[PDB]
Design an enzyme around this catalytic site. Structure first.
Site, PDB file in Angstrom:
ATOM      1  N   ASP A   1       7.504  -0.601  -5.020  1.00 26.71           N
ATOM      2  CA  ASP A   1       7.008  -1.427  -3.909  1.00 26.71           C
ATOM      3  C   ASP A   1       6.121  -2.557  -4.431  1.00 26.71           C
ATOM      4  O   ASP A   1       5.206  -2.328  -5.228  1.00 26.71           O
ATOM      5  CB  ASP A   1       6.245  -0.572  -2.889  1.00 26.71           C
ATOM      6  CG  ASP A   1       5.684  -1.388  -1.737  1.00 26.71           C
ATOM      7  OD1 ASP A   1       6.312  -2.390  -1.343  1.00 26.71           O
ATOM      8  OD2 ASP A   1       4.609  -1.020  -1.219  1.00 26.71           O
TER       9      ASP A   1
ATOM     10  N   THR B   1       0.848  -1.226   0.000  1.00 24.02           N
ATOM     11  CA  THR B   1       0.000   0.000   0.000  1.00 24.02           C
ATOM     12  C   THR B   1       0.869   1.256   0.000  1.00 24.02           C
ATOM     13  O   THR B   1       1.888   1.313   0.686  1.00 24.02           O
ATOM     14  CB  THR B   1      -0.959   0.016   1.212  1.00 24.02           C
ATOM     15  OG1 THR B   1      -1.981  -0.969   1.021  1.00 24.02           O
ATOM     16  CG2 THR B   1      -1.619   1.376   1.386  1.00 24.02           C
TER      17      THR B   1
ATOM     18  N   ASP C   1      -2.757   3.992  -3.883  1.00 20.10           N
ATOM     19  CA  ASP C   1      -2.741   2.952  -4.910  1.00 20.10           C
ATOM     20  C   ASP C   1      -4.006   2.109  -4.754  1.00 20.10           C
ATOM     21  O   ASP C   1      -4.865   2.430  -3.928  1.00 20.10           O
ATOM     22  CB  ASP C   1      -1.483   2.086  -4.796  1.00 20.10           C
ATOM     23  CG  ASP C   1      -1.546   1.113  -3.638  1.00 20.10           C
ATOM     24  OD1 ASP C   1      -1.632   1.576  -2.479  1.00 20.10           O
ATOM     25  OD2 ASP C   1      -1.516  -0.111  -3.885  1.00 20.10           O
TER      26      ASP C   1
ATOM     27  N   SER D   1       2.364  -2.490  -3.514  1.00 21.14           N
ATOM     28  CA  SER D   1       1.651  -1.363  -4.091  1.00 21.14           C
ATOM     29  C   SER D   1       1.625  -1.522  -5.598  1.00 21.14           C
ATOM     30  O   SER D   1       2.643  -1.875  -6.201  1.00 21.14           O
ATOM     31  CB  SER D   1       2.364  -0.071  -3.727  1.00 21.14           C
ATOM     32  OG  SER D   1       2.258   0.174  -2.339  1.00 21.14           O
TER      33      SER D   1
ATOM     34  N   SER E   1       3.532   0.233   2.820  1.00 21.48           N
ATOM     35  CA  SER E   1       4.777  -0.403   2.388  1.00 21.48           C
ATOM     36  C   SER E   1       5.518   0.434   1.347  1.00 21.48           C
ATOM     37  O   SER E   1       6.736   0.325   1.215  1.00 21.48           O
ATOM     38  CB  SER E   1       4.509  -1.807   1.838  1.00 21.48           C
ATOM     39  OG  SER E   1       3.430  -1.805   0.915  1.00 21.48           O
TER      40      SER E   1
ATOM     41  N   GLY F   1      -1.898  -1.184   7.426  1.00 22.64           N
ATOM     42  CA  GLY F   1      -1.873  -2.026   8.619  1.00 22.64           C
ATOM     43  C   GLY F   1      -2.932  -3.104   8.504  1.00 22.64           C
ATOM     44  O   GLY F   1      -3.073  -3.731   7.451  1.00 22.64           O
TER      45      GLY F   1
ATOM     46  N   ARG G   1      -3.904  -1.712  -5.050  1.00 23.70           N
ATOM     47  CA  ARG G   1      -3.630  -3.129  -4.808  1.00 23.70           C
ATOM     48  C   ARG G   1      -4.005  -3.532  -3.381  1.00 23.70           C
ATOM     49  O   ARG G   1      -3.652  -2.848  -2.422  1.00 23.70           O
ATOM     50  CB  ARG G   1      -2.160  -3.452  -5.068  1.00 23.70           C
ATOM     51  CG  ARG G   1      -1.727  -4.815  -4.549  1.00 23.70           C
ATOM     52  CD  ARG G   1      -0.380  -5.222  -5.116  1.00 23.70           C
ATOM     53  NE  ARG G   1      -0.494  -5.788  -6.460  1.00 23.70           N
ATOM     54  CZ  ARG G   1       0.537  -6.142  -7.225  1.00 23.70           C
ATOM     55  NH1 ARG G   1       1.787  -5.987  -6.794  1.00 23.70           N
ATOM     56  NH2 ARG G   1       0.320  -6.646  -8.433  1.00 23.70           N
TER      57      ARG G   1
ATOM     58  N   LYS H   1      -9.136   2.668  -1.526  1.00 24.87           N
ATOM     59  CA  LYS H   1      -8.556   2.829  -0.195  1.00 24.87           C
ATOM     60  C   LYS H   1      -8.893   4.177   0.434  1.00 24.87           C
ATOM     61  O   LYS H   1      -8.714   4.365   1.640  1.00 24.87           O
ATOM     62  CB  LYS H   1      -7.047   2.649  -0.271  1.00 24.87           C
ATOM     63  CG  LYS H   1      -6.658   1.273  -0.766  1.00 24.87           C
ATOM     64  CD  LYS H   1      -5.157   1.116  -0.830  1.00 24.87           C
ATOM     65  CE  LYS H   1      -4.785  -0.138  -1.597  1.00 24.87           C
ATOM     66  NZ  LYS H   1      -3.350  -0.463  -1.400  1.00 24.87           N
TER      67      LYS H   1
END
Ligand SMILES: [Cl-]
Ligand SMILES: [Mg+2]
Ligand SMILES: [Mg+2]
Ligand SMILES: [Mg+2]
Ligand SMILES: [Mg+2]
Lengths: 231, 204, 196, 243, 244, 250, 241, 195, 222
Positions: free
Chosen positions: I166, I1, I17, I169, I129, I47, I19, I33
């Site tokens: 990442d 994320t 993002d 993400s 992340s 988290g 994912r 999100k």
């Protein structure tokens, strides 16, 4: 009248009738006398029987080695209040290694009785108590009323016909306060005091109850042939 | 030891053209020991279908719980619960056990009776909603199912084509999982007809 | 973290760095560790950010309610409320707080409340991971009844060294001056204090 | 009617008759007073000697709260003790949290809110006492008087009990004749006189005088009982004025 | 204190009657009449809404007939708000039983449970009783079709035909006259409507003043169907039975 | 202390009457008139803003209240009782529904919850009934538009149109003559204004009348854009100007 | 007739205990007045110290609830201080929970809700007080919100409370009928206080010394009370024109 | 406890349960009956942690007997099994869970069918033609999978059960001291006294 | 994320993002999100996914009730204070890490909130992340007094740094812009990759390929 249904109600003149009725129960109770010198303090109590087959109701209760009381009125209430005193005396000894001062014992009894006069559901205690004791400031005598009023005195009496004994002690004040180092003479003065409250009946061997506490004297109660000496 | 893989099993759901499909294996086991080949993991409350994988005692418990709740819902609302609403109820119900959760992987499938729109949704054991258009997978062979579904799936499949796609996704995924198999059921769901088919598969 | 509070002639000054780390990553390089619990009673926070923020918010609440009833509280009273929370919840807290304030009767005062929940009234106090490196410097250079400019220099130099040696400390140097005149905020950037 | 049978009931007047009946118990009590002096306060009370059997100086009426506050009251003595016990709990919790000893105005409200709370319900009875109290804090001397209703104000001088009218008149003279103020030692003397003068309403029985004081110069801002020579000096001054 | 204002809702009279229960029953006697009739092939519930208005939205309105589950329904006489409190409790009880045993709750067990709740309010708590009388119409595979009634005392009894609410004396006499054991649902429908038509305090019995329900095994083989009649369906059955 | 009134203050009298409920209804009768009318494409609720003093700012006193984005309420009777019921109704819409199902409750069920609260004040210990009657108008996807009355007893009834309070008997007769099942929202507002004028003595304008509707979704009142399915609240309170505009066509 | 003793309905649908609590409100025989300026809100109240033994500095019916909110009370002082303490606690809790200062109107509503509860719950009596809250709200500006024993509350352009409230109310009404605005068009709070005092003098027909009045002033970010000497300066300015 | 088996045949349910009670080092008893009659046509066998087994069994027995008296009616085996499952499902998230595995064998008098339910300590319920708990199934299921027929007689079920016990006696390390066998049918519950 | 928040001259922007993963496995390629607490107060979280969503909805529910009670539009400091006090009470067992952004009558705000109940203020923040990839872009290009256009660009560029670099993400970029005095504008899939995958094969089976044992109609009607 309209204001005596519970303890939570003042009358229009600011009286608490339930407390006054509780006070009345003491007046119906048997006479008991308290008096002290500078070395000793004495309780004398006229015990009351139901009839000739019955025992004579005990009047004096020990609270500690250095403190105890006599009762007049509802005996079960005296048991509750004396139990509380036993616990408070005991708490002081266990926690502080300290014998509970008689004056402080009076303050504790006042506060316990007060809570029953300001709350709904409860009732005032129906007993009067005379507390004697010997602590770090010498001999003491206290008079407890279930109104909460506790008073330190040289001598006093409560119960039926207690006025006769109280007047006698008021006359004898200067004499019995000086009876130091003589337990027997102090008890004699107490037995003579309680005699001023007797009518028709006299002090017999199972009628009389005496207690004493002093400088080198643990609180001890005398009944039966132990009081024949004073009859 | 891991509660989510003691009993084993899988569920998969897919969307098609004016239809949805939901399928599950029939195995219940005690780790290596196969216990039952008739343990169905898909339930329905009106026209809303719920598949549940994971610890079997919780699967049974949650079915009974959602039957309980959807029955009261219907009595009060005077209508059958919809997939979107039920999805939120499942999420709510799982998260209320946040720190003592049911060890399950629920999957919702159904068609909204008013809009006619096909709907699917998945959850983790504490209620996080996965709201994916294409497919939802759950169980001890979820990795295998993701692989099968990702390659086999295409949008807007007709009911009878969707049946073949979801069936092959389940079957071949289950055959690569020790704790899944022992039979399989596929539900093909349209707005006012639902067909239930038991598949023939290897019994090892 | 590098924090300090210093009493001087006209009152007291609080000082702090602005670095907040999660391991070796700097999660915030412009943190404000000088927090206000009352008009002229501030604090410097060290330890768990969650714990020190929660404590400070409760104290600010207590002093607001105190003020509504009994008027302006003393710095000692503020320190006592801090101590009460830190001491009674010592098992579940990781907080090291310096309390500083200005009265007109008492003037500048500084109280430090370390991990255990004890209170210590001091002329000045230092705390945080970076404080270890400046015990010697601060002890040698502190004087009582310094001027405002001397005290700013003392704090600037002290935290400059703390930042220099402690990786957990850095960023800007923030300061808050508490006097009869009011409340003044100061900020000093790296290019200024690194060349000292 | 029936509005006066239950506490917390408003009469058609907007009155709480049960509180007014509590005042009658206060008016029936012995006289107690308070005098605010230059750097402190003085408290004095009339103690009726019901009998010779009462031990002199033993049945102490004035009570200390914390170490800087004195409390005296007229009416039902047990009620007053109950109020002081609460006051001691309030003062202890204040000092526990805030370190500093409880200020007198702060303490006044603690008692005030507690007494007022006993006028909110029919399950409790109002306090049958008026309490005069005060002491020295960081802002100087303070004297308060608190009624059964929970009502309280700050005072230059205060009086309650059976001889309150007499006492008040005497207090009013002191306020007029001393705008600059009264010293602590003067206040003790004056307190003795006023109790002696107020004893005319209780003239049947003789009484015992009890005085206490808190003064910044005389007692270091701590509550102390007036004893021995200073008490006798005040008794002599009082006896001289009544003759 | 507070004792002064306590009515003491849970005491006997000198005659051994529960004041509040008796007075609650008096309240219920002014409520619209509800009738239940049990036949061999089903049960009928008929009830009269109280003096309505033309502006009342009838098709969305429910004051008399309530569904407890798919097999059990109730007719209400008394305070509607009180009834809904008990109805929700009964619905939950039915679901608790279904979750526990995985079988639909037998009718009597549900009736006993609600009746016990009513009883509690007459013996302890110092609260007023529920001013409600229920007629329970239900089916289970043990006793088949069953009719029960319960009242504020918490007492319940079983019936072949029964009325609650207003004019129960007149209604019960009429039911006792024309009821027979081999009666069928369609006959029972007619008896219920005829009885209401004669006992009603209104000038005439119309569709807008009625709530009607049937529980039939006239559900496509081995099962039971509850039918809460719509306003138009009540209008039709009134014409069919020749009342309007 | 402790609440020692653990017994019912509302009890059955020998005649079967629940006195406190009857007396609560009497308090409602003394209250200012409020009404509700249901149209095919909306619902309107209205009342008079009986200002207690001209120095008072009657805009700060809301007699018509939003319960949910698609549900509104008006009352007759004791204002303070209404205010707290609105607070409880708003909260119960979340706690017993939105936090469970992720959507706002249908009108009938929110009404049911409010009714339950009012019923409990009629049986629970140491309390009196609420001295209000409520008119709750709302919309939801499966039930469409609806209007409900809730009385102090906790009883509730659905209406096509109704009135409560001071001049309810006359107002209901007025509404019976005018109401039909083909009314558009604007027609219902017009009838509402006509009906309300009869029970109003003094000034009759947008500043003395409070009026709200449950109608079309208002995307302009949503506060955000981007989610197609979210189209805004159906509850809308008419402005002082909007009322006065329709009082010229009166 | 126990329907007159506790807060249950009379046969007329009335709550007599609430009505009698309104009567207790005038027991102090004190009148208060509140008005709004451009930037401020002013509240004045009569101050009567009938006993010479009283410390006049402690005799007050104006309370500083929070930094921004002031409250004047009409009614007996015990109930006044009860309400004052609660309002202070509510204002402090609000700031802690929601991270911003409690608005004057919100506090009024909260205290009004608490009062409503006393009219419905039998064990609690109403407080015999009327509470006038004042502030300069950060969103609504100068604000006057008043609460009573019935649990009623509303905002005011200006308001008056006490035995002679009607005379003051009508006087204020007549002024705002002339000016046709909802406030006193004045820059400084000093002149708004002078307006408030002048119109109380006119309405009551009595003159005031510096010790006969009590004044509270709300500005942006603070409420404060004036000293006797501040009031004296106000009275001098009134007399000099 | 150790081995509990169950087999549902045409007209009855047969439960076989081991007789041994072993406390660590010694076999304290060799005639223990690991079963309780819940109702005239319902029998429950059990195995698990010491103490919890009998406490749980007797607790269930009492509850079913209470229901039988209150309603004057015998619950169906399915209803009894659902009650038991809920109790165990409730127990698994308790402070101290019942560590008990059960088999419920009953004859449904309404449907005229024998029924066998297997429920473990987690509350995992399954209806089966034959079932077991612990390791018992590991040795016996291969024999039952082979020989079982739904139309078996009671005598044929007993013979197949003997074969299962013989295999257990051969390949199991522990001496479980034989089994007590009980039959549940339309006439109630009876014990086979020679096995 | 990857989640970022960027302040600009007259508002704030939040981006993320799309994912959503179950460990190393991707469950949803297009997860939204960006969430609402109130109409003009948005947030995004990393988290424990259920905790971020649950805590957002709970505070959003209370914020709504609070806004109604006070007749005022909800403030970001209120969402912030309610969130942190809730999270702190649970000592990080509610694994909610959020970036909260919004406008109210007080101005425009940007906060980060961590599971243990600590909060931070800033002009630019990252989370998840992809937090470091994003912050590298933000530290390279953020400046004072950014325009709405510059701030949207910086934010989405910071998300792209996370998407590419990442592993947790990926996919699309969602954006929500909260300008002062305006309605908050939510831009779902503000950025998508152009081009679409096409497979070498179509795996659509012939009908009758799957073997079947039974069929039945399921009764879904009452
Ligand atoms: Cl509230
Ligand atoms: Mg396999
Ligand atoms: Mg295998
Ligand atoms: Mg560094
Ligand atoms: Mg009340």
């Amino acid at each position: 009248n309209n204001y005596d249904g519970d303890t939570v109600t003042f009358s229009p003149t600011g009286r608490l009738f339930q407390v006054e009725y509780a006070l009345e129960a003491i007046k119906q109770g048997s006479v008991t006398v308290g008096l002290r010198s500078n070395t000793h303090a004495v309780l004398v109590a006229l015990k009351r029987n139901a009839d000739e087959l019955s025992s004579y109701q005990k009047k004096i209760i020990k609270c500690d080695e250095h403190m105890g009381l006599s009762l007049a009125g509802l005996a079960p209430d005296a048991r509750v209040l004396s139990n509380y005193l036993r616990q408070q005396c005991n708490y002081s000894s266990l926690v502080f290694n300290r014998k509970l001062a008689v004056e402080r014992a009076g303050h504790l009894l006042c506060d316990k009785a007060q809570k029953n006069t300001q709350s709904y559901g409860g009732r005032p205690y129906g007993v009067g108590l005379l507390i004697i004791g010997y602590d770090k400031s010498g001999a003491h005598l206290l008079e407890f009323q279930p109104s909460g009023n506790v008073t330190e005195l040289y001598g006093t009496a409560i119960g039926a016909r207690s006025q006769g004994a109280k007047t006698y002690l008021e006359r004898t004040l200067d004499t019995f306060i000086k009876i130091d180092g003589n337990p027997d003479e102090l008890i004699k003065a107490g037995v003579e005091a309680i005699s001023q409250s007797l009518r028709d009946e006299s002090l017999t061997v199972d009628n009389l109850s005496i207690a004493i506490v002093g400088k080198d004297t643990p609180f001890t109660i005398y009944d039966g042939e132990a009081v024949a000496k004073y009859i | 030891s891991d509660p989510s893989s003691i009993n084993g099993g899988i569920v998969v759901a897919m969307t098609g053209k004016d239809c949805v499909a939901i399928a599950c294996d029939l195995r219940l086991g005690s780790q290596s020991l196969g216990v039952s080949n008739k343990f169905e993991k898909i339930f329905h409350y009106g026209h809303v279908f719920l598949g549940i994988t994971g610890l079997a005692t919780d699967v049974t418990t949650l079915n009974e719980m959602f039957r309980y709740k959807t029955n009261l819902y219907k009595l009060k609302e005077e209508r059958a619960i919809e997939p979107e609403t039920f999805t939120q109820l499942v999420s709510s119900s799982l998260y209320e056990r946040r720190f003592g959760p049911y060890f399950v992987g629920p999957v919702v499938a159904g068609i909204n009776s008013k809009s006619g729109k096909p709907f699917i949704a998945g959850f983790d054991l504490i209620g996080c909603i996965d709201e994916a258009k294409d497919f939802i997978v759950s169980g001890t062979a979820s990795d295998q199912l993701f692989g099968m579904c990702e390659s086999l799936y295409e949008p807007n499949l007709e009911p009878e084509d969707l049946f073949e796609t979801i069936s092959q996704a389940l079957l071949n995924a289950a055959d690569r999982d020790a704790l899944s198999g022992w039979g399989a059921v596929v539900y093909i769901i349209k707005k006012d007809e639902v067909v239930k088919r038991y598949l023939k598969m290897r019994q090892d | 973290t590098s924090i300090m509070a210093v009493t001087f002639k006209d009152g007291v000054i609080l000082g702090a760095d602005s670095r907040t780390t999660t391991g070796a990553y700097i999660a915030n390089r412009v943190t404000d560790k000088l927090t206000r619990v009352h008009d002229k009673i501030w604090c410097c926070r060290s330890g768990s950010a969650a714990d020190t923020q929660a404590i400070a918010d409760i104290v600010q609440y207590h002093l607001e309610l105190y003020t509504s009833q009994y008027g302006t509280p003393s710095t000692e009273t503020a320190a006592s409320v801090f101590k009460e929370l830190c001491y009674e919840n010592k098992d579940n807290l990781t907080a090291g707080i310096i309390v500083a304030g200005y009265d007109d009767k008492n003037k500048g005062e500084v109280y430090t409340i370390p991990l255990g929940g004890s209170v210590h009234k001091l002329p000045y106090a230092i705390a945080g991971s970076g404080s270890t490196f400046i015990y010697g410097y601060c002890d040698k250079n502190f004087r009582e009844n310094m001027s405002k400019e001397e005290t700013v220099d003392f704090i600037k130099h002290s935290l400059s060294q703390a930042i220099k040696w402690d990786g957990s400390s850095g960023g800007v140097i923030r300061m808050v001056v508490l006097t009869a005149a009011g409340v003044e905020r100061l900020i000093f950037y790296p290019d200024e204090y690194e060349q000292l | 009617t029936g509005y006066d049978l239950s506490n917390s009931v408003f009469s058609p007047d907007g009155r709480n008759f049960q509180v007014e009946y509590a005042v009658k118990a206060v008016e029936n009590g012995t006289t107690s007073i308070g005098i605010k002096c230059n750097d402190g306060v003085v408290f004095a009370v009339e103690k009726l000697i019901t009998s010779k059997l009462l031990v002199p100086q033993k049945n102490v009426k004035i009570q200390v709260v914390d170490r800087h506050i004195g409390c005296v009251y007229s009416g039902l003595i047990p009620d007053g003790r109950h109020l002081v016990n609460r006051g001691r709990e309030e003062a202890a919790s204040f000092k526990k949290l805030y370190k500093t000893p409880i200020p007198i105005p702060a303490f006044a409200d603690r008692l005030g809110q507690y007494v007022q709370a006993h006028t909110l319900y029919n399950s409790v009875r109002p306090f049958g006492v008026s309490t005069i109290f005060g002491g020295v804090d960081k802002n100087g001397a303070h004297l308060y008087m608190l009624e059964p209703s929970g009502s309280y104000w700050g005072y230059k001088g205060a009086a309650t009990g059976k001889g309150r009218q007499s006492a008040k008149a005497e207090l009013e003279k002191l306020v007029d004749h001393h705008p600059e103020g009264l010293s602590a030692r003067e206040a003790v003397k004056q307190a003795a006189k006023i109790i002696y003068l107020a004893h005319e309403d209780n003239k049947e029985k003789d009484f015992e005088l009890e005085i206490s004081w808190c003064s910044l110069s005389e007692t270091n801002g701590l509550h102390k009982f007036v004893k021995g020579d200073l008490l006798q000096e005040a008794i002599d001054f009082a006896q001289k004025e009544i003759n | 204190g507070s004792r002064r204002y306590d009515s003491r809702t849970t005491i006997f009279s000198p005659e051994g009657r529960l004041y509040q229960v008796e007075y609650a029953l008096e309240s219920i006697s002014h409520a619209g009449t509800a009738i239940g009739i049990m036949a061999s092939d089903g049960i009928v519930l008929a009830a009269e809404r109280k003096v309505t208005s033309t502006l009342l939205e009838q098709d969305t309105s429910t004051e008399k007939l309530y569904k407890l589950n798919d097999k059990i329904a109730v007719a209400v006489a008394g305070l509607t708000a009180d009834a809904e409190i008990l109805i929700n409790t009964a619905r939950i009880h039915a679901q608790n039983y279904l979750k526990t045993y995985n079988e639909d709750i037998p009718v009597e067990i549900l009736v006993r449970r609600l009746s016990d709740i009513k009883q509690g309010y007459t013996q302890h708590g110092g609260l007023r009783p529920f001013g409600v009388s229920f007629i329970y119409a239900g089916y289970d595979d043990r006793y088949g079709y069953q009719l029960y009634t319960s009242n504020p005392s918490g007492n319940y009894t079983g019936w072949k035909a029964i009325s609650v609410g207003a004019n129960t004396s007149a209604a019960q006499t009429l039911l006792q006259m024309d009821y027979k054991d081999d009666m069928k649902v369609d006959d029972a429908i007619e008896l219920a409507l005829k009885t209401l038509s004669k006992t009603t305090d209104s000038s005439a019995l119309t569709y807008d003043r009625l709530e009607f329900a049937t529980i039939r095994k006239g559900a496509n083989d081995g099962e039971v169907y509850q039918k809460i009649f719509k306003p138009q369906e009540i209008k039709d059955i009134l014409v069919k039975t020749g009342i309007t | 202390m402790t609440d020692r009134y653990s017994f019912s203050l509302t009890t059955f009298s020998p005649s079967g009457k629940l006195g406190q409920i009857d007396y609560a209804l009497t308090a409602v009768k003394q209250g200012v008139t409020s009404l509700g009318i249901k149209a095919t494409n909306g619902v309107v609720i209205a009342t008079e803003k009986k200002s207690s003093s001209p120095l008072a700012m009657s805009e700060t006193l809301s007699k018509v209240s939003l319960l949910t984005p698609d549900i509104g309420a008006v009352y007759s009777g004791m204002g303070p009782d209404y205010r707290v019921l609105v607070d409880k109704s708003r909260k119960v819409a979340h706690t017993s529904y939105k936090r469970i199902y992720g959507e706002y409750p249908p009108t009938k069920l929110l009404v049911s919850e409010v009714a339950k609260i009012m019923q409990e004040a009629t049986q629970s210990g140491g309390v009196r009934p609420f001295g209000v009657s409520l008119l709750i108008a709302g919309h939801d996807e499966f039930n469409g538009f609806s209007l409900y009355q809730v009385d102090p007893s906790g009883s509730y009834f659905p209406w096509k149109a109704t009135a409560i309070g001071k001049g309810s008997v006359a107002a209901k007769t007025f509404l019976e003559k005018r109401w039909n099942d083909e009314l558009e929202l604007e027609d219902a507002i017009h009838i509402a204004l006509l009906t309300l004028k009869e029970s109003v003595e003094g000034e009759f304008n947008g500043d003395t009348i409070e009026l709200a509707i449950i109608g079309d979704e208002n995307p302009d009142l949503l506060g955000y854009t981007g989610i197609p399915t979210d189209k805004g609240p159906r509850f809308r309170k008419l402005t002082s100007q909007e009322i006065n505009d329709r009082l010229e066509a009166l | 007739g126990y329907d007159r003793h506790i807060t249950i309905f009379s046969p007329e649908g009335r709550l007599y205990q609430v009505e009698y609590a309104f009567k207790a409100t005038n027991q102090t025989n004190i009148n208060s007045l509140a008005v709004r300026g451009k930037d401020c809100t002013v509240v004045i109240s009569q101050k009567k110290v009938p006993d010479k033994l009283l410390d006049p500095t402690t005799v007050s019916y104006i309370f500083c609830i929070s930094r921004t909110i002031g409250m004047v009370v009409n009614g007996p002082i015990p109930d006044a201080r009860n309400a004052a303490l609660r309002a202070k606690a509510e204002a402090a809790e609000f700031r802690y929970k929601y991270g911003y200062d409690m608005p004057c109107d919100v506090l009024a509503k909260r205290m009004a809700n608490l009062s409503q509860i006393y009219t419905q719950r039998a064990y609690m009596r109403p407080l015999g007080v009327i509470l006038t809250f004042v502030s300069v709200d950060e969103e609504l500006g100068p604000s006057i919100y008043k609460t009573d024993p019935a649990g009623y509350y509303v905002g005011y352009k200006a308001t008056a409370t006490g035995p002679k409230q009607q005379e003051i109310t009508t006087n204020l009404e007549n002024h705002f009928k002339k000016s046709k605005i909802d406030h006193i068009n004045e820059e400084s709070w000093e002149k708004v206080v002078e307006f408030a005092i002048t119109h109380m003098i006119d309405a009551l027909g009595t003159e005031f010394s510096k010790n006969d009045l009590e004044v509270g002033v709300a500005t942006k970010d603070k409420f404060f009370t004036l000293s006797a000497e501040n009031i004296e300066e106000r009275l001098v300015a009134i007399a000099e024109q | 406890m150790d081995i509990i088996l169950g087999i549902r045949v045409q007209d009855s349910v047969i439960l076989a349960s081991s007789k041994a009670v072993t406390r660590g080092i010694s076999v304290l008893k060799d005639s223990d009956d690991k079963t309780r009659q819940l109702s005239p046509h319902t029998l429950m066998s059990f195995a698990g942690e010491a103490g919890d087994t009998v406490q749980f069994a007797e607790y269930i027995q009492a509850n079913i007997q209470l229901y039988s008296i209150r309603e004057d009616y015998e619950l169906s085996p399915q209803a009894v099994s659902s009650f038991v499952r809920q109790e165990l499902a409730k127990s698994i998230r308790s402070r101290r869970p019942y560590q008990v595995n059960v088999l419920i064998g009953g004859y449904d008098k309404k449907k005229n069918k024998p029924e066998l339910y297997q429920i473990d300590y987690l509350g995992t319920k399954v209806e089966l033609p034959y079932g077991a708990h612990g390791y018992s199934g590991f040795y016996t299921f291969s024999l039952l999978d082979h020989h079982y027929r739904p139309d078996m007689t009671t005598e044929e079920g007993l013979d197949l059960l003997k074969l299962c016990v013989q295999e257990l006696e051969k390949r199991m390390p522990m001496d479980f001291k034989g089994v007590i066998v009980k039959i549940v049918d339309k006439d109630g519950i009876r014990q086979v006294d020679d096995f | 994320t990857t989640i970022v928040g960027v302040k600009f001259n007259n508002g704030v922007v939040i981006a993320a993002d799309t994912r959503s993963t179950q460990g190393p496995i991707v469950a949803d390629k297009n997860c939204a999100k960006l969430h609402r607490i109130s109409p003009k107060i948005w947030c995004a979280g990393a988290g424990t996914a259920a905790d971020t969503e649950a805590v957002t909805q709970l505070i959003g529910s209370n914020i709504e009730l609070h806004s109604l009670y006070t007749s005022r539009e909800p403030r970001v400091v209120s969402a912030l204070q309610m969130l942190k006090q809730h999270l702190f009470k649970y000592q990080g067992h509610i694994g909610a890490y959020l970036i909260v952004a919004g406008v109210d009558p007080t101005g425009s705000h940007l906060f980060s909130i961590h599971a243990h109940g600590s909060t931070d203020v800033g002009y630019y923040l990252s989370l998840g992340s992809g937090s470091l990839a994003a912050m590298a872009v933000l530290e390279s290009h953020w400046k004072q007094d950014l325009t709405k256009e510059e701030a949207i660009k910086l934010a989405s560029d910071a998300i792209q740094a996370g998407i590419w670099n990442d592993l947790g993400s990926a996919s699309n970029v969602d954006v929500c812009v909260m300008e002062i005095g305006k309605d908050a504008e939510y831009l779902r899939n503000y950025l998508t990759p152009n081009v679409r995958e096409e497979k070498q094969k179509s795996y659509k089976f012939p009908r009758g390929t799957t073997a079947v044992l039974k069929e039945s109609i399921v009764n879904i009607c009452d």
